[PDB]
Each structure stands twice: as C-alpha cells, then as structure tokens.
Design a protein around this ligand. Sequence first.
Ligand code: CLA
Ligand code: KC2
Ligand SMILES: CC1=C(C#C/C(C)=C/C=C/C(C)=C/C=C/C=C(C)/C=C/C=C(\C)C#CC2=C(C)C[C@@H](O)CC2(C)C)C(C)(C)C[C@H](O)C1
Ligand SMILES: CC1=C(C#C/C(C)=C/C=C/C(C)=C/C=C/C=C(C)/C=C/C=C(\C)C#CC2=C(C)C[C@@H](O)CC2(C)C)C(C)(C)C[C@H](O)C1
Ligand SMILES: CC1=C(C#C/C(C)=C/C=C/C(C)=C/C=C/C=C(C)/C=C/C=C(C)/C=C/C2=C(C)CCCC2(C)C)C(C)(C)C[C@H](O)C1
Ligand SMILES: CC1=CCCC(C)(C)[C@H]1/C=C/C(C)=C/C=C/C(C)=C/C=C/C=C(C)/C=C/C=C(C)/C=C/C1=C(C)CCCC1(C)C
Ligand SMILES: CC1=CCCC(C)(C)[C@H]1/C=C/C(C)=C/C=C/C(C)=C/C=C/C=C(C)/C=C/C=C(C)/C=C/C1=C(C)CCCC1(C)C
Lengths: 176, 92, 173, 188
Amino acid sequence: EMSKAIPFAERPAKLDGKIPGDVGFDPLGFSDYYDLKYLREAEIKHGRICMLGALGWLFPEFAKLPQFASLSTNPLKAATELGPAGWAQIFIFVGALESFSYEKIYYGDSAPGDLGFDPLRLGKNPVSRAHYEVAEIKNGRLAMIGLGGMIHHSLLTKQGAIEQIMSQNFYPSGFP
Amino acid sequence: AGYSPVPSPDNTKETYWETKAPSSQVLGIGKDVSSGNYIVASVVAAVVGAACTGQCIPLTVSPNPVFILGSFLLPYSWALHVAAWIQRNNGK
Amino acid sequence: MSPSVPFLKRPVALDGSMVGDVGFDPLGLSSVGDIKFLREAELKHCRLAMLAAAGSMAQDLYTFPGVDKVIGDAKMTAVHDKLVSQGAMGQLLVWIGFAEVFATMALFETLDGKRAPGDFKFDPLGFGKNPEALKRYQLAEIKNGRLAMLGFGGMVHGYFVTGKGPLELLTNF
Amino acid sequence: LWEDGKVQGKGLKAIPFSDPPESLPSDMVGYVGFDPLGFSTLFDIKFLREAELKHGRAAMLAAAGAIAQDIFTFPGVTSVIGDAKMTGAHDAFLKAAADGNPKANAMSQLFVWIGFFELVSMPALFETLNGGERAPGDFYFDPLGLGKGSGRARMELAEIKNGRLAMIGIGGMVHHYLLTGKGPIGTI
Ligand code: CLA
Ligand code: KC2
Ligand SMILES: CC1=C(C#C/C(C)=C/C=C/C(C)=C/C=C/C=C(C)/C=C/C=C(\C)C#CC2=C(C)C[C@@H](O)CC2(C)C)C(C)(C)C[C@H](O)C1
Ligand SMILES: CC1=C(C#C/C(C)=C/C=C/C(C)=C/C=C/C=C(C)/C=C/C=C(\C)C#CC2=C(C)C[C@@H](O)CC2(C)C)C(C)(C)C[C@H](O)C1
Ligand SMILES: CC1=C(C#C/C(C)=C/C=C/C(C)=C/C=C/C=C(C)/C=C/C=C(C)/C=C/C2=C(C)CCCC2(C)C)C(C)(C)C[C@H](O)C1
Ligand SMILES: CC1=CCCC(C)(C)[C@H]1/C=C/C(C)=C/C=C/C(C)=C/C=C/C=C(C)/C=C/C=C(C)/C=C/C1=C(C)CCCC1(C)C
Ligand SMILES: CC1=CCCC(C)(C)[C@H]1/C=C/C(C)=C/C=C/C(C)=C/C=C/C=C(C)/C=C/C=C(C)/C=C/C1=C(C)CCCC1(C)C
C-alpha cells in the first residue's frame, strides 16, 4: 500500500515491487501512463550507454590507443577531433547493434533488455541472475547520474574528470 | 459512383499490405531475388559507391565517367538493403 | 546441385531446358528479369562477339585495298577511331540501327511468347533442317559464341597492353 | 580417426572445470569442447565453421608459401622485387606496380582472382546459413578423389587441426619477420 522509496506516499499501482530494481519510486507516476515494459527497456539501455560512457570518460585519461594518442584527454575535445570517418564507423557499429534491439522491441517479446547477449554464461544461476539484474539496473542509474555530471563538468572546466579533480577547480566561474 | 473506371497499366497487382513486410511483388523484376543476394548486393554497392564518391569529392573539371556512374550505387545500396529485409521477412 | 558449380544449388530459373544450360548462375542474375530476355541478349552478344573475333583476326591478316592509306598503322580500336572520322563507322551504325529496330520488334514478339529467343529465321543455305542437326548447331553456336566473347575480350585487352593485334602479337610475343 | 570419444566429440572437454556452451555441437569435426568466451552463443556455428575453415586453409597456404618463398624463388622475380621476404615481397610488388613496372602486378592478379572466387562462392555461405544442403566448409572440390569413404573423417579432422596449427604458425612467421627481418628458415 505504501511506497518503499517514499514511506509516506502510497505505492504506485503498476509498481508492485516484483520487477527488478523496484522500490516503489515513482513520485510523478510515469508508470501509470507509459508502458512499463518499454520504460524498463529504456532504463536498461540508458544505464548500459551511461556505464560505458562513464568508463570511457575516464579511461583515456589513464591510457589512450596509440592511434588516438594526440586526441585530448577532454572527452568532448576528443569527440570534436576524431573526425567524420571514425564517427561514421562507430555510428554504423552502433546501428548494427541497435538493429537487434529494433527487432526485439517491434517484432518480438522478451524480458526487458534481453538481447541474448550472455557469452560467458554468468546468468544461469537464478540467485546470481537476480543479483546481477538488480546490480545492472542500479549501476546503470549511478552511471547515468555520474556521466551527466561528468559531461557538465567537462563543459565548465574544459578538462577531463581526473584532471579537474587533481587541479581542484571544482567550482564554476559562470556559464562557458 | 458514376465516375468512369480508372485505367491502370498492364499487370497491375495489389500491393497493399498490413503484414510485417510487403508481398515481394513490390520489388518487381527483383521479386525472385534472394535475401542473401540482396544483402551482398547492398554491401558491394555501398562500398563501391562510397569509394567512387571519395574519388570525386574534390570534383575536378574532368571527372571520371565510371566514378560518376559508380557513385550512384550508394543510393542504390539503400534500396537493396531495404529489399533484403523485405525478402528476409517474406520467407526468403 | 548445379552441375557447373557443384557446391551451389541449381538456379531456380534455369531448369536445364535451354541449350548450353549447365546450371551456371552463381550470382543469381537469372532470378532478376525474364530468362527469355537474357537468352536473347546472350545470343546477340555471342554472334556479335564471334563476328568481332573473326574480324580482328582477318583485319590483322588482310586489309582491303586502300584502307592502309586511311588508317596508317592503326589496329583495333585505333582503326575504329580513325574510321569514325572517315565515316565508315557511321554507315555501319546506320545500317545496324535499321536491323536493330527490326530486332526490337522481334524482341517485343519474343517477350510475348511468339518468337523463340535469338531466332530470326535466317537459314539461307538450309543448314539445320534436320532437328538433331539443328540442336547440335544450337549448342555449337552457344559454346562458340561464349568462347568468342572471351576471345575478343582477350584480344582487345592484349592490344591495350601491347598495342598489337591478335595474330601479330602471337607471332612475336 | 573421428574417434567420437577420443580425439573429438562427446565428453571431450578442453577445460575440465568449465563445461562447454550448450550451442556448441559435439557432432562437428574438431570438437574438443572449447568455447570459453561463448562465441558460438553469439554467432551461428555454421558461420563460425565456415570462417574457421577459410582461415585454416588461407593460413596453411600462407605458411607453406612462406617456407617455399624462403627456400626458392621463381626465375626472374628477383629482378622485379630485389630481395624481399614475406610481407616485404607483398610491399615490393605493390611499390613496383605504383612505380609503373609491368611484371609487378602479381598481387593485383591474386586479388582479382581470389576475389572472383569469393564473390561467386559468397552465395554458398548464404545457402548454408539458410539451412541448405551444403556443409560449412565443403566446396565439393575433391578431383583426385583423395578424401572419400573411410578417410573422410580422418581427413576432416586433420584439415581442421593442421589449419589451426597453420593459423598459429603464419602469425608466428609474420611477427618474426617484422622483428628480425628474416624468413621461416632464416630464423631457425
Ligand atoms: C555522481 C554524481 C556527481 C558528482 C560526484 C559530482 C561532483 C561535482 N560536481 Mg556535479 N553534477 C552532477 C552529478 C555529480 N557532480 C549532476 C547529475 C549534475 C547535473 C547535470 C551536475 C552538475 C554540476 C554542475 C553544473 C557543476 C558541478 C560541479 C561539481 C563539482 C563541485 C561540486 C560542488 O561544488 O558541490 C557543492 C554542492 C552543493 C551546492 C549542494 C547542492 C545544494 C543543496 C541545497 C543540497 C541539498 C542537500 C539534500 C539533503 C539532498 C537530498 C535531498 C532529497 C533527499 C530530498 C564536483 C566535482 C561544479 C564544477 O565542476 O564546476 C567546475 C559545477 O559547476 N556539477
Ligand atoms: C574490294 C573491295 C573494296 C573494299 C571493301 C574497300 C574498302 C575500303 C575502305 C573501308 C571502309 C576504305 C576506308 C577504303 C579506302 C580506300 N580505297 Mg578501297 N576498298 C575496295 C576496293 C578498292 C579498290 C579497287 C581501290 C580502293 C582504293 C581506295 C583508296 C584510295 C586511295 C588513294 O588512291 O589515295 C582508299 C582511300 C583505290 C586505291 O588507291 O587502290 C590502290 C582503288 O583503286 N579500294 N577502301
Ligand atoms: C554483459 C556481460 C558482459 C559484460 C560487460 C561489461 C563490459 C560490463 C561493463 C560495465 C561497466 C563498464 C560499468 C560501469 C559503471 C560505471 C559507473 C557506475 C560510474 C559511475 C561514476 C560516478 C558515480 C561518478 C562520478 C564522478 C563524477 C560524476 C564527478 C567527478 O568529479 C567525481 C566522480 C568520478 C566520482 C560480458 C562481456 C562480461 C559478457 C557476460 O556474459 C555478461
Ligand atoms: C548461321 C548461318 C551462316 C552463317 C554464318 C556465319 C558467317 C558464321 C560465323 C561464325 C564465326 C565468325 C565464328 C567465330 C568464332 C570465333 C571464335 C570462337 C574465336 C575465339 C578466339 C579465341 C578463343 C581466342 C583468342 C586469342 C586470344 C584471346 C589472345 C589473342 O592474342 C590471340 C588468340 C587467338 C590466342 C551461313 C552463312 C552458313 C548461312 C546459314 O544459312 C546461316
Ligand atoms: C601482408 C601484410 C601484413 C601482414 C600480415 C599478416 C599475414 C599478419 C598475420 C598475423 C597473424 C596470423 C597473427 C596471429 C596471431 C596469433 C596469436 C596471437 C595466437 C595466440 C594463441 C594463443 C594465445 C593460444 C593460447 C592457448 C589456447 C587458446 C588454447 C590451447 C593452449 C594455447 C594454444 C596455449 C602486414 C601486417 C605486415 C602489413 C603489410 O603491409 C602487409
Ligand atoms: C549534443 C551535445 C550538445 C552540447 C553538449 C555536448 C557537446 C556535450 C553534446 C552532448 C551532450 C549530452 C550527451 C548531454 C547529456 C546530459 C546528461 C546525461 C545530463 C544528466 C542530468 C542528470 C541530472 C540532472 C540528475 C538529477 C538527479 C537528481 C536531482 C536526483 C535526486 C535524488 C536524490 C538526491 C535522492 C533520491 C531521489 C532522487 C530524485 C533520485
Ligand atoms: C547521341 C544522340 C544523337 C542525336 C539524338 C539523340 C537523342 C539520339 C542523342 C542521344 C543522346 C544521349 C543518349 C545522351 C546521353 C547523355 C547523358 C545520359 C549524360 C549524362 C551526364 C551526366 C553527368 C556528366 C553527371 C555527372 C555527375 C557529377 C559530376 C556528380 C558529382 C558528384 C559526385 C559524382 C560524387 C560526389 C558529389 C558530387 C561532386 C556532386
């Protein structure tokens, strides 16, 4: 009856706590209006995107591929520097990956975010599978928040995350 | 209701579709082509068209006719890959 | 299946009925279009290319009186370019275009099923009255025309590489 | 051999502690139960076997050719490519082609003909993936009649094993050339 996330508010009707990563947090009630399976798939995809993005916002600051050594440790500056051909190849790779999602969303039914990618067979144990599902959701959420923060910090300081931390210019000087 | 019947060309079929994919009569002369054939055609056309376009991007006063002709394979590859899908989902 | 390419399936369009049909269509170009159109095109190419190969040899060997003055040392496509200015190629084009308008009528008949592909009823000397002889001759025509397409390609490209006509090339190399 | 229970197939497990993926077939020739990273789950095993056999054949040819080129060169190729070994010969032929020397189009001819075969054979792969009669690697090219009947099973396993070995060996050769600048025989 009562939401776990907000103990003083009634539990959202669609969020009954059975689905992974459900703590009854929906103050604005997106689940009432929009399809819950679609919302879950979108959340999982965003979490995966942002997990990779948060990892790659910091990895070049530690090591760069020999081809892209000259590219800036600032991820935005590196994006500007990469050039149309490499970005086009990345876009084609991403579109080839997203063709499978297109097929699974519009012409198939399955667990939200299940594209059949489990090469190492880490999800066969049900208990470990449940822990991994919740962990994926929560790490994706944390990565979304962290990567949004990272993008804005790079906008402000015009530097990488580690460089900003080391130089301790944590505070803004105004709009860029 | 008194309108004269509308004349249409010979061998005009019904192409309206509410299925997952059109009926493969939409592809006309290429209706019997295989989905694998369409896939290979699309990939080859895309590669050749991109190469021939790159060979002409800084257009000179005397461009190569063969490169001009082959540059038209990049738009062609789009149709081919769309057909590949259609033919894959029509059973072939 | 596909006797020609043993690791590929027999082409769907090719059922083995037509002469010189060894189930050869790896790229599946018979699926697109009408096979009658492709056979008409193949026989046109066969006859044209074997005429072309025999003509390349015969031009290398003998030349009509007074053509040496007009063409100089030109051979093959050089002769083509030299005589376009003179006007010989223009007259050939006019007459071949006449014949090809009538062949257009013939092709339209073929697509309607009235005419067998490549059949223009041209048999003055009467060879092929006997059905078995006609079948043999049809197979020989197709095979020789294919061999001649390849041969003329080889001759023209050997001229491109070396600048020598077929037999003049073969003599010295 | 085709020792279903000895050299390939059935309980054969390369890694005792970790079982193979369910998708990997134990009926396939060369099955030692080895697929830790689960590539078979991601990709069709027919495609993977086609790729493995193509790679093994190309690498076997490459290794045999490296040895043959080191021990002998055809009459006259030295004139056109000086003294070049392994990938150096490839680069030398391409540089002479650019320089304008004829007799230096060997790599272009190789590419043309091999690409012709691949283009005409590309359909075969598609038919195999579409549940066709053709097996992944079988091109029905057995003119001498060498592998037929009983031998077949020893021949397929030998082909796969020698192909994997040549895949390793050609990489070793190429990298040894890149470091030392020597050939297969030169290194040893
Ligand atoms: C993982 C999350 C994360 C982390 C670790 C950081 C870290 C940082 N951010 Mg932030 N940031 C994030 C996410 C994150 N950000 C996100 C998601 C955004 C929005 C896109 C931003 C947008 C942002 C901007 C625009 C800027 C930073 C900046 C900074 C730096 C200085 C922070 C500071 O001055 O704090 C000071 C902290 C505060 C002022 C606290 C907020 C004030 C209220 C009153 C606090 C209320 C507390 C309350 C109990 C919270 C819960 C209530 C609720 C339960 C009811 C620092 C490196 C600055 C920077 O790098 O400048 C160059 C900067 O200008 N960040
Ligand atoms: C048997 C049939 C026959 C054919 C099929 C044929 C075809 C062509 C073609 C093809 C398209 C060209 C382009 C061409 C050109 C010239 N011919 Mg020729 N010709 C034939 C017969 C004769 C005869 C009998 C004579 C002759 C000549 C010339 C001269 C003169 C040049 C000059 O005198 O300056 C030139 C330029 C006269 C000559 O000079 O011969 C020594 C001459 O008497 N031709 N002739
Ligand atoms: C699917 C699957 C597989 C897999 C896999 C893979 C490859 C999984 C990869 C997972 C990854 C890369 C997860 C990354 C998560 C990153 C997070 C949560 C970052 C948070 C950053 C934060 C909070 C921050 C921050 C910060 C900000 C914003 C401001 C800064 O001043 C400070 C700070 C730095 C603290 C494999 C291939 C093994 C197969 C298997 O069968 C199953
Ligand atoms: C039908 C019909 C009739 C008719 C007719 C007529 C006029 C029929 C004419 C038929 C002809 C002219 C056939 C010619 C075939 C030529 C071939 C196959 C050439 C191959 C060359 C090769 C392979 C080559 C090559 C080469 C290459 C590539 C490299 C070169 O360096 C040299 C080299 C040579 C080595 C008649 C009149 C009987 C009446 C009948 O009532 C109806
Ligand atoms: C022609 C040309 C070129 C070229 C080129 C070529 C032809 C390059 C070829 C490169 C090749 C063939 C590299 C192979 C690497 C193999 C490795 C690392 C295997 C590792 C195996 C392991 C770790 C096994 C581990 C284990 C496993 C899995 C299983 C069992 C136990 C064990 C086996 C120990 C260039 C590049 C020079 C450029 C030039 O302009 C043009
Ligand atoms: C396309 C383009 C244009 C110009 C910029 C650039 C070149 C980088 C390029 C790309 C831009 C991109 C990818 C921008 C992306 C922006 C992102 C990811 C922004 C992220 C914003 C995230 C925000 C606020 C999160 C706010 C979270 C809050 C309150 C959380 C508060 C909470 C707390 C504290 C307790 C529990 C309850 C709740 C509500 C969860
Ligand atoms: C021959 C004759 C005699 C009398 C009457 C008759 C009507 C029969 C008449 C017949 C005439 C005929 C059949 C004419 C045919 C001519 C045709 C089809 C001409 C076509 C010309 C087209 C041209 C250049 C196209 C060039 C395209 C270009 C640069 C494109 C540029 C580009 C490319 C390729 C890639 C990068 C982007 C960029 C730079 C824009």
